[PDB]
Design a binder for this molecule. Structure first.
Ligand code: HEM
Ligand SMILES: OC[C@H]1O[C@@](CO)(O[C@H]2O[C@H](CO)[C@@H](O)[C@H](O)[C@H]2O)[C@@H](O)[C@@H]1O
Ligand SMILES: Clc1ccc(-c2cnc[nH]2)cc1
Ligand SMILES: Clc1ccc(-c2cnc[nH]2)cc1
Length: 464
């Protein structure tokens, strides 16, 4: 009945078939033995893994509803639980995703206003790197600044200065937490939290970090109440507050205080740590393959020039840069073991019966590195997204934002951020570092529920 897999042991589950290389390396080895759809017991819990573009789509697209449930990540479950639009299920999920989409669009998502804020934020970024004057720097903080300011403007109603001390702290917390979430420790914790939770570990520092961020969120929510004008909501929080007051009538409403706190935390995270991390890998990749960079700048020069601000319309006439960004996303592989799903009802899949609430991991990494769709999946090559004519070549295998009903809410804003921030930085600068291109290390610094590049230093030099 469940998909096949290695026989589990009492207590240990399938620990014996696990690998110290982490979940992804482990699952890859079990797949060779049991095929594309198989079962691994994480501690006592059966989890169905789905490998390859075809298996992943057959589930998340062809039985979209059955595979639309949300599973759990043990290490963020203490603080986050199943509140907000991301880790919720059923009517709460349906209500909060719809609410969040509608609301983000009211404050600009997919419209000229957010396009302008990204342009404005890029211009702030260029001015800051000119002040550095060649000098090598670690771009982690700035890449976080520029992406967080876009979501902050939609959620908190403001952007923050690059030297704001409380902004620095929050971004430090986000970076450290995403890495901690991605560490070998969190994976071991996913197996054995019932036992490990009593002891020191990554899981504890993650609860503390998330709680410190949640304090800031609480502060911001209170201050939103004080200045709340019911006929001009400035942002996501106000809009939520207004709906909250209106629905105090219903006792089973989803719009309560906890869903607000966690809704904001969810959006704040992931708007600080996703596009930001992708970008950071992008320029490490630009350091390793400078010929790719030059070919991007040459296309910038032809389509845009060296002075006007890039626009989203410019991307449609820039297939090569677009392909490069696709390839940066395919390679950097932000969410490898995907994100935990589960089936909402008893489900028949490839002759298997998955009982209701069975966890399901769509191994997105196996789609992004699918050999039937990409000639050399382990290598960074823009040609994976170019056809013979040099036009942008789409791929069903390209699912860095996943697919189906749970598909990333921020896909649009993330694609637009990546294009505008990437294309604007290379318009004004070229990049270099002490480290020889052949010595550039592309192995992840942490690989787990997220993928994080190695730390590096980089120089932004004006190009005459
Ligand atoms: C490169 C940037 C991003 C990537 C690669 C990305 C990727 C993903 C992935 C893989 C998921 C899980 C989908 C699944 O469960 O199957 C997800 C979910 C989600 N993302 Fe993103 N995301 C990115 C940026 C953002 C941004 C900027 C936002 C909002 C500002 C955002 C909001 C969300 C939300 C709300 C969900 C949960 C969707 C749901 O459960 O309905 N993400 N994202
Ligand atoms: O990047 C391709 C990948 O993204 C998705 C969902 O984000 O694109 C959706 O919109 C596409 C644009 O045409 C459609 O082709 C695609 O069918 C649609 O689902 C995935 O679907 C697609 O694999
Ligand atoms: Cl706690 C948390 C919240 C959101 C994400 C996310 C959404 N889309 C991409 N990453 C990751 C982790
Ligand atoms: Cl529900 C969920 C969980 C994790 C992520 C993620 C992994 N890596 C980055 N973001 C996204 C969505």
């Amino acid at each position: 009945h469940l998909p096949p897999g290695p026989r589990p042991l009492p207590l240990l589950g399938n620990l014996l078939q696990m690998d110290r290389g982490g979940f992804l390396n482990s699952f890859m080895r079990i797949r060779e033995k049991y095929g594309d759809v198989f079962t691994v017991h994480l501690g006592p819990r059966p989890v169905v893994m789905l490998y390859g573009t075809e298996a992943i789509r057959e589930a998340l697209v062809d039985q979209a509803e059955a595979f639309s449930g949300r599973g759990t990540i043990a290490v963020i479950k203490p603080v986050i639980g199943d509140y907000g639009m991301i880790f919720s299920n059923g009517e709460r999920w349906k209500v909060l995703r719809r609410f969040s989409l509608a609301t983000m669009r009211d404050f600009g998502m997919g419209k000229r206003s957010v396009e302008d804020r990204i342009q404005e934020e890029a211009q702030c970024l260029v001015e800051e790197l000119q002040k550095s004057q060649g000098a090598p720097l670690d771009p982690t903080f700035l890449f976080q600044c520029i992406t967080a300011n876009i979501i902050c403007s939609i959620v908190f109603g403001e952007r923050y200065d690059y030297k704001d001390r409380q902004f620095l702290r929050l971004l430090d917390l986000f970076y450290r937490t995403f890495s901690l979430m991605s560490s070998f420790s969190s994976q071991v914790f996913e197996l054995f939290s019932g036992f490990m939770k009593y002891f020191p570990g990554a899981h504890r520092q993650i609860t503390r970090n998330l709680q410190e961020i949640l304090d800031y969120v609480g502060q911001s929510v209170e201050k939103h109440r004080a200045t709340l004008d019911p006929s001009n909501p400035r942002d996501f929080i106000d809009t939520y507050l207004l709906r909250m007051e209106k629905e105090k009538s219903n006792q089973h409403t989803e719009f309560h205080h906890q869903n607000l706190l966690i809704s904001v935390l969810s959006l704040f995270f992931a708007g600080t740590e996703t596009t930001s991390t992708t970008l950071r890998y992008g320029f490490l990749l630009m350091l390793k393959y400078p010929h790719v960079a030059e070919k991007v700048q040459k296309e910038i020069d032809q389509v845009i020039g060296s002075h006007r601000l890039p626009t989203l319309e410019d991307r449609t006439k820039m297939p090569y840069t677009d392909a490069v960004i696709h390839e940066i996303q395919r390679f950097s592989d932000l969410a490898p073991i995907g994100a935990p799903h589960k089936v909402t009802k008893d489900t028949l899949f490839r002759g298997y019966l998955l009982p209701k609430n069975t966890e399901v991991y769509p191994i997105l990494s196996s789609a992004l590195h699918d050999p039937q769709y990409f000639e050399q999946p382990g290598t960074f090559n823009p040609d994976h997204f170019l056809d013979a004519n040099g036009a942008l070549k789409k791929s069903e295998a390209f699912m860095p934002f996943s697919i189906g009903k749970r598909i990333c809410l921020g896909e649009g804003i993330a694609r637009n951020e990546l294009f505008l921030f990437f294309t604007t930085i290379l318009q004004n600068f070229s990049v270099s570092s002490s480290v020889a291109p052949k010595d550039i290390d592309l192995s992840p610094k942490e690989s787990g529920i997220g993928k994080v590049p190695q730390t590096y230093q980089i120089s932004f030099l004006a190009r005459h």
